[PDB]
Symmetry: D2
Subunit: 268 residues, 4 copies
C-alpha cells in the first residue's frame, strides 16, 4: 500500500537471491505491486529463488537473444496478468559480457563475436524489449534499465563499459517511441554491488589483476560518495527503481538517475 | 498519508499562487508533511497567498541577502516546529536577476553590481541557506534547489543562465558538507512554467525581442519532449521535488533531476 | 612545409572526391606529410580518385571486417613507407550502417545482424585498427576518428548514432593502450557535410521522411552555430584533423574536438 | 615563422616567469606573433619579467575590475600595434580568489564580498574583456580563456571552482557576440602547474590541510592521464593555446579544449 500500489510490473534479470533485480522485485511487492518475472536457461533454479519473494508471482521464460521469445512475450504476459489488464512497468535489470570482453583479456584482445554477443544482451536487448512490450503498457507507464557511468574509461570493465554507453544511447531512442504511448524510458546508474557474479570476480575468478582492480574500484567509491556507499546493500538502488516506476517522476524520460551515493559528482 | 508523511519541510520562494514553490508546498501538504514557509518583503501579501494552502503553516521572514536573517533562521524555525523537532527537508525555490541581466540589455551591457546581486540570490544563497539550516536537520534529510539546464547558451536568459551554472556547481560543494550529516543536496532542473513573472515577460514586459525569444523557447520545448510539456502546469515539477524529499531517492546527492519532459535529451 | 611537415599519416575512408577523408588527405599533403591510403572493395575506383591528390601516395586494401587485412596491415604499411620508418598519424574516417539501421526503417525494426554489421565497422573497427598499427607508430604520434555528437537523440540517424556513442567510448579505452606508446587517441566531432552518401539521402533516397529530417537537421545547424556552418565545405573539419596530428595538441587524449561551428554549445 | 606568424595577440595574466601566460607569450613570440601584454599593480615588476621574452613587446596596464581601464583598453592597444592594424588574438590567462574562498576557510565560511571579488576577476572579467576588445579584432580572430574542469566537486578549490563553472558558461555567451564578428571564443582547461602561486600553497601557505589536498590532487593526475602529466612544464598547455589562436581550429567556438593529459576522461 503506497508507491507501487495497484500497478503491474515485469521485473527481469533475477538469477540468484543476490541479483539486483531480486531486490527490486522484493521492494516492488513490498509497495503493493503485482509482478511478473523473467528467466533465462536455469529456470527451475530461479523458480526456487523467486518462490522466496514476499508474495507469489509468475515466471515467464525469456531469452533476450531469442526471436520467438520476443514475439511470444506480449501474449504470455497477458495470460498471466489477465487479458484486458495492461502492464504498468518494465524493469530491464539484464546484461552480459564474456570473460574475454571483461577483465581476463585486455581491451584489444576481445573478438567482435564476443563483443557482439555482449552488446546484444546489454545494449540492443533494451530496445527489443521495449518493442515487444510497448503495445500492452498503460499510459503513464514506465520502462527502466540498469546501467553504470561510462563517461570515463576505467580498468577491468573494458568492453562491458562500451556496452553500457551504447545502452545509455539506446535509452534515448526508446524514450522517443515510448513517448507516443505516454510511456517514460529511463536508466538508473548504480554503484558497485556484491552480487554472486561480482563477488566471484573480486575473488580473483576472472584473473587476479582484474579482481584487484575491481577491488580498488569499490574502495574508491565510498571515498567520493558524500553519503557513503554500501556495496553489499542493493536496497538503495532497488528503491530508486521504485521511485521511477511510481508516478512521482512523471516528467523525466530518456534519462539516467544515479544511485551511487553521489560518487559521480565528486573527483576526490 | 504517504510519501512525505510525518516529515518537516521548509518551502521557500512563494510570492504568488502561480510561483513554483506554492505548488511544491501544496503537493507536500497533500502528502502529509508539516511545512514552514519563507517570505521576502511583501509579507502580508504572501501571508494571504499561503493562507490558501490545504492546511495552515507558519511564515518566517527570510531575505537571503540579509545576514541577520541567516543567523536568526535556525532558531526561528525551531520555535515554529517545536524545539527538539528537526527539519526533514529544505526547498530553495528562490532566484533573482535584474531586467538588465535578463533580456532587456544584451549580455555585455549588464554591470557586475547587477550581475552580482543576481548570483548572490540565485547561486550563493543556496549555500548560505544550507549553512543556516544544516545543524537542525534530521539525518536522511534532503536539501533541494530549483534550476534549469545551462549547458548550452540560449537567448534571453543571458546572465540568469550563468547564475544557474554557478548554482549547479555550488550544489556539489553543498553535497559534501551535507554528506557528513547524512543529508542529500539536489537540484531539479525544470522546463518553462508560466508563473506571474514568466507570463509578464512573454507579454513583452522586458522588451519585445526578449518576449519573442522566450515565446519561441517554450514553443520548442514540447517539440523535443517525448512526453510533451505543459508550461502552465507546475504539478509535474512539484511532484518530482516531492520524490526528492521523500526517502525514495536515498543514494543521490549533488545531483540534478530533470523535470522537463525529456527535452534536454533530445536534439530535434 | 609547416604543421604536418615530415610526418607519416595513414588516411582511411576515401571513396569519392566528396568523402571527408579525401579532404583530410589533401590538407595533409598540403602540410608536407607523406601519406598512405586505405581502400575497401571498389579499389580501381578509389585509385583514380586518389590519383588526383596534390602528390602521389600508395593505396593498401583494408576491409576493416576482414581479419587477414588487420593482420597484414602492420607490414603492408612498412614496405610502403620504408622499413625502419614509423607511422606518425592514423585517421579513421570510416563508418557504415545499413539503410534499415539508418532512416528507412524506424528504430525498433532494425535487426541485430544489421545493427551488428554497423557497430563493427564504425565502433569496434577503431579499436582493431589501433591494435594493428600501434606497434609501428612513433611516440608523440596520433590516432584520430571521425565522429558526431550522440548525447541527444535525434531523428533519422537512429542506430548510426548509438554506433557513434559506442565509438566515443571505445576511443577512451584506446586512449589507454596508446598512452603507453606515448600515442594520443582522439575524435573530431563534425557537423553535417554533403558527401556523395549524404547528398543521396537528402535527395530522398533512403525514404522521403528521412531526407526531410536530415534536411531540417542541417537547416538548424547554421542557425545555432555562432560562426555559421557550411555543409558543403569539408575543409574546416579537415583542418581540425590536421591540428590533431600536428604536435600542437600534445596533452589531449581520449577526447573529442568539435568541428561544428559551435552548434553543440548552443540551444537555439 | 609558422602557426602564429604575422598575427597580433594580446596576452594577459603574467606576473612571474612561472605564470602560465608567460609561457603562452613565449611560445607565441616563438611562432612569429607580435604580442601586447597586460599588467595589474606590480608593474615595474612584470616589466622586468616580460623584458626576458624572446622579443620586445609593450605593456599596457589593465586592472580588470577598473572601468576606466576597460574603456581605455581598446585605444591603448591601437596606439601600441599601430592604428589601422587589428587584433588577431586575446588570451585571458587571468583569475583570482581570496585565501578564504580557496582552501584556508571551508566552503560555507567564505562571505559573498570575497566570493564576489573572486567571480568578478575570474568569471565576469572574460566578458568585460571580450567587450572592450571585440571592436578592434580581425575576423577569423580568437579569444581564449584559461580554465579547469569544474564538473565534479573537489577539495581545496572550493569557490574558485564555482568561479570557473561560471567562467565556462560566460564563454558560451561570449561565443555568441563574437560570432557576428566572426571571432571564436574558447577555453583551454589545464591540469595543475607549479606556478609561484601554486607552489606556495603546496608549501602549506594557505593551510596545511589544503596544501596536502592539492598535494594529493596532482599526485592523482599523472595516475589517470594516459600520456602522463608534468605539473612543472607549462609548455604543453601553452602550445594548445597557440593551436587555438592559429587558424587550425576554425570551426570551434564556445568550447573547452583539454590540456590535461587525458585525466578528465579517465576514472582510475
Ligand atoms: N556490479 C553491480 O552491482 C552493477 C550492476 N549493474 C547492472 O545491473 C544489471 C543486473 O546485474 P546484477 O544483478 O549485478 O547481475 P546478475 O548477473 O545477477 O543479473 C542479470 C542477468 O543477466 C541475465 N542473462 C544473460 N543473458 C540473458 C539473456 N539472454 N536473456 C535473459 N537473461 C540473460 C541473467 O539471467 C541474469 O539474470 C546488469 O545489467 C548490470 O551491469 C549496474 C551497475 C553495477 C555495475 O556493474 C558497475 C560497474 C562499474 N562501475 C560501477 C558499477
Ligand atoms: N521559468 C520557470 O518556470 C522556471 C523556474 N525555475 C526556477 O525556480 C525558482 C522559482 O521561480 P518561479 O517560481 O518561476 O518564480 P518566482 O519569482 O515566483 O519565485 C521565486 C522567488 O524569488 C524570491 N526573492 C528574490 N530575492 C529574494 C531574497 N533575497 N530572499 C528571499 N526571496 C527572494 C521571491 O520572493 C520569489 O518568491 C527560480 O530560481 C527559477 O529560476 C527553473 C526553471 C524554470 C526556468 O526559469 C527556465 C529557464 C530557461 N529554460 C528552461 C527553464
Ligand atoms: N554527414 C557527415 O558529413 C558526417 C560524417 N562523419 C563521419 O565521418 C566518417 C566519414 O564519412 P563521410 O566521408 O561523410 O562518408 P564516406 O562514406 O564517403 O567515407 C567513409 C567510408 O566507409 C567505408 N567502408 C565501409 N565499410 C568499410 C570497411 N569495412 N572497411 C573499409 N572501409 C569501409 C567506405 O569505404 C568509405 O570510404 C564517417 O564515420 C562519418 O559518420 C561525422 C559527422 C558527420 C555526420 O554524419 C553527422 C551526423 C549527424 N549529425 C551531425 C553530423
Ligand atoms: N594551477 C594551475 O596551474 C592552473 C591554472 N589555470 C588558470 O590559468 C590562469 C593563470 O593562472 P596561473 O598562471 O597558474 O597563475 P598567475 O596567478 O600567475 O596568473 C594570473 C593573474 O591573475 C592576475 N590578477 C588578479 N586580479 C587581476 C586584475 N584584476 N586585473 C588583472 N590581473 C589580475 C594577476 O596579475 C596574475 O597575472 C588562472 O585563471 C588559473 O586558474 C587553470 C588550471 C590550473 C588549475 O588551477 C587547476 C585547478 C584544479 N584542477 C586542475 C587545474
Amino acid at each position: 500500500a503506497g508507491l507501487l500500489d495497484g500497478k503491474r510490473i515485469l521485473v527481469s534479470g533475477i538469477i540468484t537471491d543476490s541479483s539486483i533485480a531480486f531486490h527490486i522485485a522484493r521492494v516492488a511487492q513490498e509497495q503493493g505491486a503485482q509482478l511478473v518475472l523473467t528467466g533465462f536457461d536455469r529456470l527451475r533454479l530461479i523458480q526456487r529463488i523467486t518462490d522466496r519473494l514476499p508474495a507469489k508471482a509468475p515466471l515467464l521464460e525469456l531469452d533476450v537473444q531469442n526471436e520467438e521469445h520476443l514475439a511470444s512475450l506480449a501474449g504470455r504476459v497477458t495470460e498471466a496478468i489477465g487479458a484486458g489488464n495492461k502492464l504498468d512497468g518494465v524493469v530491464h535489470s539484464i546484461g552480459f559480457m564474456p570473460q574475454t570482453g571483461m577483465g581476463i583479456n585486455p581491451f584489444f584482445d576481445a573478438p567482435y563475436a564476443d563483443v557482439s554477443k555482449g552488446i546484444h544482451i546489454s545494449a540492443y536487448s533494451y530496445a527489443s524489449m521495449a518493442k515487444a512490450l510497448l503495445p500492452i503498457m498503460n499510459p503513464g507507464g514506465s520502462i527502466v534499465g540498469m546501467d553504470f557511468d561510462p563517461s570515463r574509461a576505467m580498468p577491468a570493465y573494458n568492453w562491458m563499459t562500451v556496452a553500457k554507453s551504447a545502452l545509455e544511447s539506446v535509452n534515448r531512442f526508446v524514450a522517443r517511441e515510448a513517448g507516443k504511448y505516454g510511456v517514460r524510458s529511463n536508466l538508473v546508474a548504480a554503484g558497485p554491488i556484491r552480487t554472486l557474479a561480482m563477488s566471484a570476480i573480486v575473488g580473483g575468478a576472472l584473473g587476479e589483476e582484474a579482481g584487484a582492480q575491481i577491488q580498488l574500484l569499490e574502495e574508491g567509491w565510498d571515498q567520493r560518495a558524500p553519503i557513503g556507499w554500501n556495496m553489499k546493500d542493493a536496497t538503495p538502488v532497488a528503491k530508486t527503481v521504485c521511485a521511477l516506476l511510481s508516478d512521482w517522476l512523471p516528467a523525466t524520460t530518456g534519462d539516467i538517475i544515479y544511485a551511487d551515493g553521489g560518487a559521480h559528482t565528486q573527483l576526490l
